[PDB]
Design a binder for these strands. Structure first.
Ligand SMILES: [Mn+2]
Ligand SMILES: [Mn+2]
Ligand SMILES: [Mn+2]
Ligand SMILES: [Mn+2]
Ligand SMILES: [Mn+2]
Ligand SMILES: [Mn+2]
Ligand SMILES: [Mn+2]
Ligand SMILES: [Mn+2]
Ligand SMILES: [Mn+2]
Ligand SMILES: [Mn+2]
Ligand SMILES: [Mn+2]
Ligand SMILES: [Mn+2]
Ligand SMILES: [Mn+2]
Ligand SMILES: [Mn+2]
Ligand SMILES: [Mn+2]
Ligand SMILES: [Mn+2]
Ligand SMILES: [Mn+2]
Ligand SMILES: [Mn+2]
Ligand SMILES: [Mn+2]
Ligand SMILES: [Mn+2]
Ligand SMILES: [Mn+2]
Lengths: 103, 78, 97, 99, 94, 105, 98, 83
DNA sequence: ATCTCCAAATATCCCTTGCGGATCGTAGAAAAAGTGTGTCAAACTGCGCTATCAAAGGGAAACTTCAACTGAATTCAGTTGAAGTTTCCCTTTGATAGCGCAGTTTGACACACTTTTTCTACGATCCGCAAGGGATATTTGGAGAT
DNA sequence: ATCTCCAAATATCCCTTGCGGATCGTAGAAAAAGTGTGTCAAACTGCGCTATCAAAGGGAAACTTCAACTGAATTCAGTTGAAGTTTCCCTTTGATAGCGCAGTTTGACACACTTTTTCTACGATCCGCAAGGGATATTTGGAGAT
């Protein structure tokens, strides 16, 4: 498998097929799906790393959508990347405006 | 049917959005805003359903419609 | 015993921001979806997840809008959201002219 | 047999693999997995979409790792972009070695 | 080398609608951006529709539902009838 | 009839539109009626903006359409405003508009 | 000596500028700023003159429209004066960050 | 020669003209530095993408198209400069 | 009420240009024709999942009671931004010259695509059992009263 | 401050169910092989970009003055939220009816593709002339003064 040659868990062969069928261009070079598979793998790692921690913090061993949302919105860069995405069953960050709290 | 979106339900929505105090006129505005939101999404979702020559609105029809509106939703077939 | 106005509201805020449950009851929401759809095309069925997709999108939308509505209320040195705060938020979002 | 339900494809196994790499004792619910699959699909479409425009803009017929790279640089915010360019460059370097 | 534009067609349509009105160089460049932009938006949406439905071809049906997704209200209605009228007239010939 | 535009009753170029559809990687195949329909849509939208912009030009005692007229046209029209809601027309300026509270008393 | 009341000239400035379409930022200064910011991303860049004009058209348009939203925020708070907090409220609701 | 502090070339009268066009009657002294900061962030974001297009094309001259493409990328499509 | 006066509007003169309308000659692309081929329409079908039904209980929504605390109005004064004036910085304008580099071009080929055969990864499907659900009890964090 | 007193957080324990691993079976990825064209590297080149200077003068900066704006402070009517009672309808559970989605097969014909003919649309170029648009002077609408 091309994934093994590249050091990746994500499927270089599937990614290549999907690029060929998505009508992005006439031709796809051989490095393209490797590069792309690697980037998709890196981002799923980045998200899963922070969500795992949010699961830990919430005293749970299973990542649920809430932990994915916590991870995303507490992370400046992931929050930007997913700035127009809604995670189903994620809820919101705990946030109360100062002026609403009693003195 | 729009009245099935009750005052308590709208209050709960507002609580999640961080609202402490709500004018009595909010409940009618909200219903109007939600109606507009649903019409726009459902309009598009139904255009997709019809284009596929189907009689059944799929979650994908909704997902694609939400994507068109710049309201991408994860969790239902993205 | 009586909690002061706002104390229970503040409790409620804390409660709902910790959870992820849909806050509109499921059947009234389903009826609304079907009524709106009927207006565009008669004789439609829905996948159950299609309706759920719409409810998740709708609530996400309204919660975020109430966040912006709240900021506009606060901007005006008030603590109470008013229709005008919704209208200002929607104008700035470019949802309304 | 004979009449076969169409095979659905997802990223679920590679996501679970990566999850074991980063959190050996952490699991994932099926709703969370669905979100993760949407994420991967959304990001794939966004990147290959730029790469396509890039090739068109430049009168080229091929999407290469170069278009993927600049597309990652357009799509991703600062640090995420830096780290994704490393990882993509390294995978390509490693892959072209292995013959 | 050749720079292709929609200029001559925009000029023609301008003469139909406003026979004694000219158009500045910058105004025309704007009209060219406009035509290209709408082409892109429509073709893009049509592309998605064929993919979503597993078809290998963009037909006028894809163009039509793309038009209905992209244009508001009255504008979609008249574009649909202009588009359908043109396909009808075109098939009627060969 | 020779040209496909002529056959379709069209000013806009059906053949260019077909080629642009084929070379834009939108799908493997383009049907025969696709470029006719799209050419017609493009022609119609250009007629509509040109009509409204010529009227703006005349409102302004002018004989030639400049970007300002295109901008006045687009933003005074609800549907064109919406279609071009995220578009900037170079040298268009804005619409005359002062909020009430700012006027003297 | 003659003196217009405060706000009279401001109103006629609005009328004046709302009628015209010319760029309102001096041209060489804008071009230096563009060139400085670009150099921080890549040294040794040249610019087509139309590239800088495109950026000035977009920038002024962005800022005009942000000032419209800012004014609505000021009016909402019962003022007629725009303040930094109006621009901030406007950018926050737009989803603009940094 | 070194370019520094060119944001200060976005003068106060210039910012005031833009605000007039935007309909603004009265302007706080604090607006001008707020506006500079906002413009800086706007230009950094568009120029960053524009330069990425230039680099990709193996060119050293930022073309109008690189900017138009960057503007489109940011949901700020511009008409009048090609494309 | 009525006059004074400032700047935007209107009128006049010349004049640079940038438009519509030419004619040109010509590259490149569209149309025309001929043949190859794979997409998708239709028809028949099987069954997943959508709609529906009947009932019942329990909790949510609606309604009512009360008055706390909020939004809105009023007054007023220090703060501050607008208007106008004066000085002169540095932008604008125009024109020159040098060359950096964008864009065209042409041979060689490395790389991607297409085709066919073999191999094996990832899909569907299955279910023991551990994480999380749900119920009950106890502890802890505060809010409101005195 | 200190005591009362709610409600959320935490603890504890038994039940439920969907995670996650294991098993079988194939669609799709890889290997191998033969084919061509897009890409790349290298040669030459003239557009327009950088730069620079000069001359003039438009507009920026920095000042004084003070009008009127912001916002602080105060007041209170009433619209809110909290907690009571009453009324309604959502959800849950167990299927049964059957719509219409989606699986399978197929050959006609719509669309590809390649070659030759026809003609559109481009780039280069002069031309009449209203269309502005800049420089110079006069009248006008109304803001502010008397
Ligand atoms: Mn029916
Ligand atoms: Mn780890
Ligand atoms: Mn620097
Ligand atoms: Mn001309
Ligand atoms: Mn030829
Ligand atoms: Mn108050
Ligand atoms: Mn009141
Ligand atoms: Mn005070
Ligand atoms: Mn001051
Ligand atoms: Mn000075
Ligand atoms: Mn070169
Ligand atoms: Mn447990
Ligand atoms: Mn629990
Ligand atoms: Mn305590
Ligand atoms: Mn599972
Ligand atoms: Mn196979
Ligand atoms: Mn070579
Ligand atoms: Mn001056
Ligand atoms: Mn009272
Ligand atoms: Mn049937
Ligand atoms: Mn008079």
């Amino acid at each position: 498998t091309r994934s093994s040659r590249a050091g990746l868990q994500f499927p270089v062969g599937r990614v290549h097929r999907l690029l060929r069928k998505g009508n992005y261009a006439e031709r796809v070079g051989a490095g393209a799906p490797v590069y792309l598979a690697a980037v998709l793998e890196y981002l799923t790692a980045e998200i899963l790393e922070l969500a795992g921690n949010a699961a830990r913090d919430n005293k749970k061993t299973r990542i649920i959508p809430r932990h994915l949302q916590l991870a995303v919105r507490n992370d400046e860069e992931l929050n930007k990347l997913l700035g127009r995405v809604t995670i189903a069953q994620g809820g919101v960050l705990p946030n109360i405006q100062s002026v609403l709290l009693p003195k | 049917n729009i009245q099935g979106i009750t005052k308590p339900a709208i209050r709960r929505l507002a609580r999640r959005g961080g609202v402490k105090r709500i004018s009595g006129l909010i409940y009618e505005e909200t219903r109007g805003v939600l109606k507009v939101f649903l019409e726009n999404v459902i309009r598009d979702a139904v255009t997709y359903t019809e284009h596929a020559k189907r009689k059944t609105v799929t979650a994908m029809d909704v997902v694609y419609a939400l994507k068109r509106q710049g309201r991408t939703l994860y969790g239902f077939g993205g | 015993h009586r909690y002061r106005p706002g104390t229970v509201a503040l409790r409620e805020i804390r409660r709902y921001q910790k959870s992820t449950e849909l806050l509109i009851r499921k059947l009234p929401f389903q009826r609304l979806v079907r009524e709106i759809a009927q207006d565009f095309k008669t004789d439609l069925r829905f996948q159950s997840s299609a309706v759920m997709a719409l409810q998740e999108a709708s609530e996400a939308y309204l919660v975020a809008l109430f966040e912006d509505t709240n900021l506009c209320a606060i901007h005006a040195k008030r603590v109470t959201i008013m229709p005008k705060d919704i209208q200002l938020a929607r104008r700035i979002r470019g949802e309304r002219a | 047999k004979k009449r076969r339900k169409t095979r659905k494809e997802s990223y679920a196994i590679y996501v679970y693999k990566v999850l074991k790499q980063v959190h050996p004792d952490t699991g994932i619910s099926s709703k969370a997995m669905s979100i993760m699959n949407s994420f991967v699909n959304d990001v794939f479409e966004r990147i290959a979409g730029e790469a396509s425009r890039l090739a068109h803009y430049n009168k080229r017929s091929t999407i290469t790792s170069r278009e993927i790279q600049t597309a990652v640089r357009l799509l991703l915010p600062g640090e995420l972009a830096k780290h994704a360019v490393s990882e993509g460059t390294k995978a390509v370097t490693k892959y072209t070695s292995a013959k």
